[PDB]
From Swiss-Prot:
Upper taxonomic lineage: Bacteria, Pseudomonadati, Pseudomonadota, Betaproteobacteria, Neisseriales
Catalytic residues (UniProt): D286 (nucleophile), E328 (proton donor)
Site, as annotated: Transition state stabilizer: D444
InterPro entries according to UniProt: Amylosucrase, Amylosucrase_C, Glyco_hydro_13_cat_dom, Glyco_hydro_b, Glycoside_hydrolase_SF, O16G_dom_2
Protein name: Amylosucrase
Physiological role: Catalyzes the synthesis of alpha-glucan from sucrose. Catalyzes, in addition, sucrose hydrolysis, maltose and maltotriose synthesis by successive transfers of the glucosyl moiety of sucrose onto the released glucose, and finally turanose and trehalulose synthesis, these two sucrose isomers being obtained by glucosyl transfer onto fructose.
Key words, A-Z: Glycosyltransferase, Secreted, Transferase
Main location: secreted
E.C. no: 2.4.1.4
Effect of H187Q: 98% reduction of activity
Subcellular location: Secreted
Length: 628
């Protein structure tokens, strides 16, 4: 294997001797050179573990490093300052100062210029982080809401231009907001140039995707493949018009990229550098589990998939140190946590906490949540969860069957109940959700619907507003970077138009993808409306989280409340949080509270609380008690 020093001399070979001497003394070069020395051994090792003695590895690698140099040389100085800042501040992601939001540009604000106009509102709300949903060119009509990319460079013209995007990013930065975008690196749309050319047999795009002559290997693979959109097609494969079969983990119009081809890595790394130089702070690594395939396995979470991501990480450490990764792994909790690492994805979605928030509202019993917060919350240094309540996607019940078994819960039966409950097919349910991808062969089903629809706000359940506050309180205080699905903060309901729209009707996720509700946002400063109650409560919790250092970091220790309905945990040995998941008053006893200080201030209600006597929480009440 070649070394950093050797490879740097060859990067410099593009320059004439005179030009070369100038480059070698430049500040950009010395920074690049230093970072090469620190981070290149990781890159080489990770790529070696995947590609081994592959003839194309060394030529690919030199090509990639030449690009890395050109990209960093072109990188704006403002971004270079952030590179240095985060390089020396790895835990910026763990600060209680951070509160994130997510929205679709078109649904929330029409276009990119419109989103820019909404930035003062994001400041009002206190956001330091904004995820904008897929922005780039996609086929018309069905495109998995932008997740089938036809071009990584051309902005969706209904959103605006690449120029509008730069303005947006610069304005976010000016407002002290990090820009967060999707890195859709597992698959492209079938109308992407690479896809067309690969299928047409253009030798330049040989082995860019997984194309088979017939069903022989697909049938073999499908033996161990989990079905993601079983409504759309069975197994992992779709048929071309010429009779061949292609790997399509998601929709038929999403073709999986072939990472067993090193040229695919290089291609996507080039795309990553492009996004980096737009000033993107965090890349959402879409569908991380799927980037490696192997016969007889689930083709998810394979070691090579982890290595490739660690290789991408090293490319950023070299050529755009500011750029951090957010892992999307909606999988078994044992698998979820493995993507999270300083050298892998510094942050990642926390589906376990999210799913269990909803579970607990349904069952009124904190057992599963308590278990998760006890044994699966704490993370390695310099990493953090992204804690969320809702997202653009359905809710999956991705808790561990093995964990549930310890509690005498059958995962299968439990998911049956949760699915019935949240789609309003269980007696007395407050939830108004919609099924998503019910799979007759497995009994699996997921749930669509907005946070407000799922807590009972559509029918004016008098408990709805408090339920929203409770769920968000937990995402805001457990430790990690909290993410608000924008619209939730004013109690936005389902889009009921989705089901009769032929572009959307086979995808119930559109139920929870409504447009900016003008009427609700106009009500946000009125405490007699649901919109205003929700907004005020959330804004207060955000204000508390950001100003109070007791929320800092990602670590917690759970507190045994001795009440099956009340969750308890401690932050920094100074903040004691209680959340009542029962719709009735629930008590933490004086006996349970003996070790606590006599009095403690509650940050939620703003009152002093007596802890040397029984503590009764009202239905869905949250308390944030300063115990030190």
């Amino acid at each position: 294997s070649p070394n950093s020093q050797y490879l740097k001399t060859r990067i410099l070979d593009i320059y004439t001797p005179e030009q070369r001497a100038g480059i070698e003394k430049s500040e950009d070069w010395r920074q690049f050179s230093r970072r090469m020395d620190t981070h290149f051994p990781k890159l080489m090792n990770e790529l070696d573990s995947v590609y081994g003695n592959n003839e194309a590895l060394l030529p690919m690698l030199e090509m990639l490093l030449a690009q890395a140099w050109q990209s960093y040389s072109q990188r704006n100085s403002s971004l270079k300052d952030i590179d240095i800042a985060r390089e020396n501040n790895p835990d910026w992601i763990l600060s209680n100062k951070q509160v994130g939001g997510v929205c679709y540009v078109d649904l929330f604000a029409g276009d990119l210029k419109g989103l820019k106009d909404k930035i003062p509102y994001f400041q009002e709300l206190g956001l330091t982080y904004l995820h904008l949903m897929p922005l780039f060119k996609c086929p018309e009509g069905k495109s998995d809401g932008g997740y089938a990319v036809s071009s990584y460079r051309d902005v969706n013209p209904a959103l605006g231009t690449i120029g509008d995007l730069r303005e947006v990013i610069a304005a976010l930065h000016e407002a002290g907001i990090s820009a967060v975008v999707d890195f859709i690196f597992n698959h492209t749309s079938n109308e992407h140039e690479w896809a067309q050319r690969c299928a047409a047999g253009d030798p330049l795009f040989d082995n860019f995707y997984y194309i088979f002559p017939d069903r022989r290997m697909p049938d073999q693979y499908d033996r161990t493949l989990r079905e993601i959109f079983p409504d759309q097609h069975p197994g992992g494969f779709s048929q071309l018009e010429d009779g061949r079969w292609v790997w399509t983990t998601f929709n038929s119009f999403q073709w999986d990229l072939n990472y067993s081809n090193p040229w695919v890595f290089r291609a996507m790394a080039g795309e990553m550098l492009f996004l980096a130089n737009l000033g993107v702070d965090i890349l959402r690594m879409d569908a991380v589990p799927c980037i490696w395939k192997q016969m007889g396995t689930s083709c998810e979470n394979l070691p090579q998939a982890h290595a490739l991501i660690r290789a991408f990480n090293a490319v950023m450490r070299i050529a755009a140190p500011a750029v951090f990764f957010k892992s999307e792994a909606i999988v078994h909790p044992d698998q979820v946590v493995q993507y999270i690492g300083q050298d892998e994805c510094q942050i990642g979605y926390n589906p376990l906490q999210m799913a269990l928030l909803w579970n607990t509202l349904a069952t009124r019993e904190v057992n599963l949540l308590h278990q998760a917060l006890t044994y699966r919350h704490n993370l390695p240094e310099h990493t953090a969860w992204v804690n969320y309540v809702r997202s653009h996607d359905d809710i999956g019940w991705t808790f561990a069957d093995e964990d549930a078994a310890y509690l005498g819960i059958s995962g299968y039966d439990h998911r049956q109940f949760l699915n019935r409950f949240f789609v309003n097919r269980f007696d007395g349910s407050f939830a108004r959700g919609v099924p998503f991808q019910y799979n007759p062969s497995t009994g699996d089903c997921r749930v669509s619907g907005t946070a407000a629809a799922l807590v009972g706000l559509a029918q004016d359940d008098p408990h709805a507003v408090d339920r929203i506050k409770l769920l968000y309180s937990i995402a805001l205080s457990t430790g990690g970077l909290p993410l608000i699905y924008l619209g939730d903060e004013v109690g936005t309901l389902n889009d009921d138009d989705w089901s009769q729209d032929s572009n959307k009707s086979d995808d119930s996720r559109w139920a929870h993808r409504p447009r900016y509700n003008e009427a609700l946002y106009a009500q946000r400063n009125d405490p007699s409306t649901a919109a205003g109650q929700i907004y005020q409560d959330l804004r207060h919790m955000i204000a508390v989280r950001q100003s109070n250092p007791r929320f800092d970091g990602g670590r917690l220790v759970t507190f045994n409340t001795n009440n099956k309905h009340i969750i308890g945990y401690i932050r920094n040995n100074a903040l004691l949080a209680f959340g009542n998941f029962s719709e009735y008053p629930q008590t933490v006893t004086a006996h349970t509270l003996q070790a606590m200080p006599f009095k403690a201030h509650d940050l939620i209600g703003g009152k002093t609380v007596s802890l040397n006597q029984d503590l009764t929480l009202q239905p869905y009440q949250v308390m944030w008690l300063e115990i030190a």
